[PDB]
Design a protein around this ligand. Structure first.
Ligand SMILES: [Ca+2]
Ligand SMILES: [Ca+2]
Ligand SMILES: [Ca+2]
Lengths: 395, 395, 395
């Protein structure tokens, strides 16, 4: 029953056959010390050529071997405050950082690794490798893992890798399309025959129950568009577009930085608590931002970019939320809503309600279905500001 | 396949939402020795104020206490010839007679209690009470029971009742609406796909089976209108309107008395055996009653009031039936038939047949439903003559 | 004669029969440590199932027993600074906090209980319970009380509760409609016959007195809409919607928080002294808010939400007031004004003036009547900021 800003602001394009295709250009360079990954929503995998940045794998340019090694890595997720390695334990895994920040404490906290960083190089070759530092994850993220045994098996499979390893011991264009499949929000409405036969004259309680079902389906659509893992702006956003706050509260400098990373930002999405925190920061700084009108409706804005509240954005137990800055459009490469209309029996242009059967207990069943998904045409269309402290008050 | 006189004679009114409301006035007096009850079909309950007729409860006019005591009584039914109490057994229950006649035989048959009579007064207060007479039920009826333990608990709950009991030891208008909910006659018609695909050209065996189903539903409607317990003229009739025959056969004096109790009686309903017995009585008395025309159809009548046969009126094993005298109308306060038309898919104005599903065995299922009920606007609209001996012949 | 902003801003809906019905959904969870209540204006009562949160009543799910226990609690109001319990006095009452904050000082001020908190658990079972802490009420509020004797009586009534107590010693959907009855503002206008016979040519002093009467009735309507106990936005507002100021003066952070709790807030209502205090806070912070136009009339606003003055909001002797943030509408679930037009003799669409009689002293009497009430469709439509210090100046 709440406002669904993402549903009414995202343009909707008609897919054919319940599928969409997005052509991706992935520019990457070899030798800059940072590994680039391919992200399909929440699942990520290392580019086989990028893997050649490895010191023990430099100058190896055999597509088969690199592809096999890339396929043999395992994706892992780490939470905030979780310890990945401890001093003294033998090192046997190569860790490539895809997202998040990991503070490494030596025997003296050395530094903090970030996206594209590596630790566990020497563990691949020799068995004497031992973790001499402890890695504590300050922020949640993903991580690719290459085991020593798997690497030894891959070496024993390909003679060329063996020979190169024995010898060593002594902008690239990659197009790979991304396919989006329409997800479904489905439900079954059970209406008793008595409720359909009698309560139908001045108002249809069947029709009112159907309206409630449709509202619940739309709320689920918004919740999935925000929080789903396969598609969904929070997770299906480029790892480079996710920023961390400079101080923790959503200061206006953070909003300026969020507007810096992309051209023609359309709007901000944040929790109402986050909007209250931003207002508190504005009052502390002493500046009063203007309000702009969209669709004949006035709304708070920053630098003329409207800030829209969304209650479906999760709030962590540590009272930290995230802010989304995103541009929408098809002619301008942005974020589009994939949806198929023209269903066989539409109560609503995007909906389909169909009679299923009548049970022995005289209960009619209806199937209410809608098909939806989200696509991000270019990587720089959704930016996420993370770990925004929303429980800060002036003191 | 038989004639359904009640279905075609009762006027039908359209209920909204499958419910009807009847406003009841219940005039009662305190101190006349007879307790008045509230009857909702076959379930009856004593008026809390009427309960103050009790000698040990006179002058108590606390609504809470009387209401609690009234709620704590239990309804019981007794059959003809059943013994309720026996001499020697300790008395522990207060019995309020709601219907029927009970002959009380002392240590010498004292008399016969009837509707509104009480026995078991002294049993409420003291534990020494002992049944010194035997009560044999000559006629079936209902009876309210108040246990000694329950009364002691109610006394121990309310201090005011205690104080009044300790002290004693040394026309009223009550409006209470009655709500009628539409009952349903439902059935499932299973038609094989072969019978629907082939046998459909010159006549539809599916349509003939549906017609048979509709006829069975109408017969069930009549049987419920006569014999059902919640609604139904035999049971949902005022206890004052039920009369007993003077001699046992349906003599014309009994018909005159049945016509006496209400104004503008519309018709009589009786079993064909009962009509034969009435004809035998008429022949014995030597008078030949006239016949009147309703709907262009001639029918036997008494005093110009048509007598209609109904085979759904039960015949007891002792060969005793009952006769119903009833007036129908809405402008004239009488008996109406509650029925809702305008169903979503009507083969007939009151019917609804809907396709359910087709089974794996290629059997189509149809749901045939009709909604009906009966309402009696005023108490003096249905009178019942009971224990009519129908197996009497001249000798 | 003052401006009545609430009268002219609240939309008015036509009730039928002088009554309105609001369908309430009350989502509650068992085991989260907070008890949920049902509020009908100023009278509140604990949910029987919520009462099962009690440690000694956990896992008891008998509707009769819980309903009885809930009915047997007593509602109490406490003022600011009032001491409820003192150390040393034996504990005999269970206190469930419905509103307000209560600071508990042990033998060391432990903490401050708030809405949904409980103290007095152990007092229910044993008679040795003694208050060992003193509870001082910092803010006015309500409180449910369950006495030990009443609980013992309820235990002695139901055997199931006994058995469960002996054994222990060793999201839920609840729909309950709320009914609103139209209140009446009535008065008698006494006009002398001389004033009606002579002073009627160039102007009617009778008509001017009637106009003054109508103005007084409208002022009383506004005062009741704000301050009445049964209906009225100050009291008939959800206990969760009432907030406390962070510092005491109405700082802009408090206004941001007040706008945070609900979507599409329509306007603020505050005393003119409160508006002066808010302006002082704005000047201290150095920001100058914009002004918006409603009905062709310019008005001060915060974040585009107009701030309207209302002199009917009480000012406490401690110079503390309250602010109301509220959205109005029927299509958008908000606050509506229940009012019935089409009266038998209307001088004004909502009014009814009728001649009563002429006294022996030649004084004509007129009855001026209007019917009004207020309804809040959803709980999150009126928010109240309380204890706003309005006598603070820069120093
Ligand atoms: Ca690289
Ligand atoms: Ca009586
Ligand atoms: Ca709870």
């Amino acid at each position: 029953i709440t406002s669904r800003w993402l549903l009414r602001m995202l343009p909707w394009v008609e897919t054919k056959g319940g599928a969409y295709r997005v052509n991706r250009r992935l520019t990457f360079t070899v030798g800059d010390g940072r590994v680039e990954f391919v992200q399909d929503g929440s699942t990520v995998r290392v580019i086989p050529q990028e893997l050649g940045e490895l010191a023990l794998l430099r100058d190896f340019d055999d597509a088969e071997v690199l592809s096999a090694i890339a396929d043999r890595c395992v994706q892992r997720d780490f939470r905030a405050g979780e310890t990945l390695v401890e001093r003294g334990t033998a090192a046997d895994e190569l860790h490539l950082i895809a997202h998040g920040r990991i503070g490494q404490a030596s025997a003296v906290t050395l530094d903090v690794l970030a996206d594209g960083d590596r630790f566990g190089e020497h563990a691949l070759l020799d068995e004497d490798a031992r973790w001499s530092q402890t890695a504590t994850a300050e922020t949640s993220g993903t991580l690719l893992t290459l085991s020593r045994a798997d690497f030894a098996a891959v070496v024993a499979n390909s003679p060329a890798l063996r020979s190169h390893l024995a010898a060593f011991t002594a902008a690239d264009y990659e197009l790979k399309p991304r396919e989006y499949e329409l997800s479904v929000a489905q439900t079954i409405l059970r209406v008793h025959t008595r409720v359909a036969d009698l309560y139908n004259g001045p108002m249809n309680q069947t029709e009112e129950q159907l309206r409630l079902t449709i509202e619940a389906l739309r709320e689920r659509q918004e919740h999935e568009l925000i929080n789903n893992r396969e598609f969904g702006l929070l997770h299906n956003a480029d790892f480079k577009q996710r920023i961390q706050t400079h101080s923790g509260p959503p200061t206006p400098d953070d909003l300026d930085e969020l507007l810096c990373r992309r051209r023609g930002t359309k709007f901000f999405l944040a929790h109402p608590r986050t909007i209250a925190a931003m207002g508190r920061e504005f009052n502390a700084r002493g500046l009063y931002p203007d309000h702009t009108d969209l669709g004949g409706q006035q709304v708070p804005a920053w630098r003329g970019v409207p800030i829209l509240p969304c209650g479906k954005i999760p709030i962590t137990p540590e009272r930290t939320s995230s802010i989304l800055a995103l541009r929408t459009g098809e002619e301008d490469q942005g974020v589009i809503g994939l949806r198929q209309t023209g269903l066989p029996d539409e109560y609503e242009p995007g909906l389909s309600v169909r009679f299923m059967n009548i049970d022995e207990k005289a209960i009619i069943s209806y199937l209410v279905s809608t098909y939806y998904s989200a696509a991000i045409l270019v990587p720089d269309a959704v930016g996420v500001l993370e770990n925004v402290q929303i429980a800060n008050w002036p003191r």
